[PDB]
Structure 1
Amino acid sequence: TGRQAQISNITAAKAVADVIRTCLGPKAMLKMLLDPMGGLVLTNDGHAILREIDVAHPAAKSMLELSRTQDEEVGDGTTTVIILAGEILAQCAPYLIEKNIHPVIIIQALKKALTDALEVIKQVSKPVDVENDAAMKKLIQASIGTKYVIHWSEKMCELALDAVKTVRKDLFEIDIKRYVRVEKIPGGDVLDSRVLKGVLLTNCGLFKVEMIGDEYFSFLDNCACTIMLRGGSKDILNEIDRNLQDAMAVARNVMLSPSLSPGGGATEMAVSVKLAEKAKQLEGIQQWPYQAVADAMECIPRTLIQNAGGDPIRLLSQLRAKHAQGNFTTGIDGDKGKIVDMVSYGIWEPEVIKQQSVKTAIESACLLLRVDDIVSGVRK
């Protein structure tokens, strides 16, 4: 009731965020679930975790719809963004339930925080040309490092980058890439693919019909592109779409935001050290809840340290000093927990990855603060 009802809502998102802390990165851990029916689900993806679990906390139910929005854009690595919404709720404990800070005052501070965050996003902006196929090849392979299809992606990711550019082009560049039709053929080898430019069913070169147990082959000459995938196993087709069909978000994000940000949770390192410097120039009542947001920003990279088995207190001492002094291009190695910068790490992510992450986090955090209490038993 009142402030006591908001405490249960903070711990509701805190308990869920603590489970997905280990779900980020190539070192991401797994979680096992036990339902009252006796079924067990063991996976490292937080998407199916929030869908199968029915939570008794009404505040945690709002995070289920937020995960559907984050998964609609990318879906890989964006599940852990909910932690940022949970760290802000825990950050208000010295303020909301102690200093009696009004929620709108915190929301107004988040409005200035979201505005200043986009300025920091434009500071780490690193544009790159999309005409180079080799530059775009290593870009889509970023999310592949979490799977064993890495060495298989040589004949896989090349088909996705060529099909999107046909249905993208320009107009701005806004277009519809959903006209592509991907066909999956079970059995065979993953190395076997089909290169087809046209519509699958003037001066046509040739017409032929192959032999396939599923259906036949038909070519339609236009004045649109299709993909025929041959999987290396029976049920592997589910993971193939995650590394190709779901990987189309990388090709969509590079067209909307050609700029590149540090990948593997290395972006918010330069954001947290910069947000603390922008707070000293505010000099107001809202400075304390505004500066405390940087304390919630440094909790996200600690997930890598928890995955790398390091000490987040001692390691971030030198790590935060590199982003606030040397340069903002430095980063954190997630594998071994090392200071190796993102320059030689070879992975960069678009700016929109963190843009949609912070935008949906602030919008979801303020709505949870606007709720005074929760009542039950209405019998609708």
Structure 2
Amino acid sequence: SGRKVQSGNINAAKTIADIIRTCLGPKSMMKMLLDPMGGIVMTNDGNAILREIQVQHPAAKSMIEISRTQDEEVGDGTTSVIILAGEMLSVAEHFLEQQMHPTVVISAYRKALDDMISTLKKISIPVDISDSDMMLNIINSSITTKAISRWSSLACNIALDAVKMVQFEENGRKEIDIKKYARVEKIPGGIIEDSCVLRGVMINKDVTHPRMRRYIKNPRIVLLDIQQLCEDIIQLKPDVVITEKGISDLAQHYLMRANITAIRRVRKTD
């Protein structure tokens, strides 16, 4: 108890902080993992090694979870956070030992972070938006030094369209964005240059029997989950209705009587 518990927490923190302190940068060293059966894997990624390693101390588990949840939040920097936290705790070593309460340390750290935010906002050189030259400079800065060195153009164009097909002007001016509504289609086959961008979602599923009309100049898609609903849809007569129930041939002709084209066996992901 006493200082010993905090010392244990922060030592367990420093250990997993400096276990991979070498693993960042364009010249990262490659770490060595072996399971207790002889299986061998050679890893160069901090997230992978932190995932595969097994540790028991609660502080280490908490910081590993912090890194893991920060991974999806921002992507890059997933190891710099761990290195920074470990180094800050290792320097707090010397103040914990000289008998000062953690409260003043927390206050000083919060003041330091408040200064951090302003200082970062100050020195940051401005950059414009969608201009090709420095955008490609950014691509070289971050996307390159990896296995897409000889295929950077496809990533560039995909990113350039992607940053423009997920715009959300919900509560401001396009400041809202998402990374999960992009209808990405990773289908193997052909040269890698076959990739392209198409405006609007597309679905891997369609009608089993294409003896029927699907394309209309004004597609009024309606979401839906017994023919009572089928002829109650006539309230407005949408041309296309998307549902999750199977359609028979007689049911398909009932849909035609209802001026709708339903779909079956489609997951919520679509």
Cα displacement string for residues 34-75 of structure 1 (whole angstroms, at most 9, x for unaligned residues): 233443332111112222212032211111211122201232
The answer (yes or no) to whether the contact 1:168–1:175 under 8 Å persists in 2 is yes
Max radius of gyration: which structure?
A: 2
Q: Matched residues in 1 for 2:51 and 2:191: separation?
A: 33
Contact 1:199 1:221 in 2 (8 A): no
Equivalent residue letter for 2:77: G
Aligned pair in 2 of structure 1 residues 110, 198: CA closer, same or farther (>3 Å)? same
Q: Which runs of 5+ in 1 are unaligned?
A: 202-217, 224-380
Deviation at 1:125, TM superposition (A): 2.3
Q: Is the 8 A contact 1:63 1:82 kept in 2?
A: yes
> How many residues align structurally?
206
- Matches of 1:115 and 1:46, distance apart in 2: 28
Cα distance change on mapping 1:220 and 1:144 into 2, 3 Å: farther
Task: State the alpha-carbon separation in 1 of the partners of residues 10 and 107 from structure 2.
Answer: 19
Find the partner of 2:183 among 181, 193, 216.
181
CA distance in 2, matches of 1:168, 1:177: 10
Per-residue CA shift, 1:160-206, capped at 9, x if unaligned? 221221211533222444321111122432233224223323xxxxx
Give 1:159 deviation, angstroms. Answer: 1.2
Paired amino acid for 1:6: Q
Query: Could you say which residue in structure 2 is the equivalent of 1:137?
Result: 136
Q: CA deviation at 1:219?
A: 8.3
Alpha carbons 2:34, 2:41 under 8 Å: kept? yes
Indicate whether 1:63 and 2:63 are aligned: yes
Q: Is the 8 A contact 1:14 1:86 kept in 2?
A: yes
CA–CA distance in structure 2, aligned partners of residues 117 and 194 of structure 1: 42
CA separation of 1:135/1:43 partners in 2, compared to 1, >3 Å: closer, same or farther? same
Please, what TM-score do these two structures have when normalized by structure 1?
0.50
Identify if the C-alpha distance between structure 1 residues 222 and 162 changes in structure 2 by more than 3 Å, giving closer, same or farther.
farther
Give, in whole Å, the separation in 1 of the partners of 2:141 and 2:31.
24
Q: 2:30 is aligned with what amino acid? A: L
1:89 is matched with 89
- Which of 197, 201, 221 lines up with 1:199 in the alignment? 201
Q: TM-score, normalised by structure 2?
A: 0.68
Alpha-carbon distance in structure 1 between the residues aligned to 2:141 and 2:179: 21
One-letter amino acid matched to 2:121: K
The one-character-per-residue Cα deviations of 1:259-310 (angstroms, maximum 9, x if unpaired) are: xxxxxxxxxxxxxxxxxxxxxxxxxxxxxxxxxxxxxxxxxxxxxxxxxxxx
Q: Percent identity?
A: 58
Does the 8 A contact of 1:22 with 1:28 survive in 2? yes
Distance 1:9 1:200 in 2: 50
Alignment of 1:20 with 2:27, yes or no, is no
Task: Give 1:100's aligned residue.
Answer: 99
The C-alpha deviation readout for 1:14-53, integer Å capped at 9, x for no partner, is 1211122111111111111123344333211111222221
- Within 2, Cα distance between the matches of 1:10 and 1:153? 42
State the superposition RMSD in angstroms: 2.4
**Equivalent-residue separation in structure 1 for 2:22 and 2:103 (angstroms):** 32
User: Does the 8 A contact of 1:13 with 1:86 survive in 2?
Assistant: yes
> 1:114 aligned to 2:74?
no
- Residues 184-263 of structure 1 mapped to structure 2, 5 A cutoff: 184-201=186-203
Contact 2:67 2:81 in 1 (8 A): no
**Shift, 1:221, TM fit:** 7.5
Match of 2:260 in 1: none
**DSSP 3-state at the match of 2:163:** helix
CA distance, structure 2, for counterparts of residue 16 and residue 131 of structure 1: 39
* Matches of 1:120 and 1:64, distance apart in 2: 28
CA distance in 1, matches of 2:94, 2:202: 61
Partners of 1:153 and 1:192 in 2: how far apart? 14
1:83 is aligned with what amino acid? I
Tell me, in whole angstroms, the C-alpha distance in 2 between the residues paired with 1:115 and 1:17.
24
| 1:198–1:105 CA distance, 2 compared to 1 (3 A) | same
Query: Within the alignment, does 1:150 sit opposite 2:135 as a pair?
Result: no
Supply the AA of the counterpart residue of 2:88: I
- The equivalent residue for 1:358 is none
The DSSP-based 3-state class of the residue aligned with 1:33 is strand
Counterparts in 2 of 1:61 and 1:36: CA distance versus 1, 3 Å: same
> Structure 1 or 2: larger helix share?
1
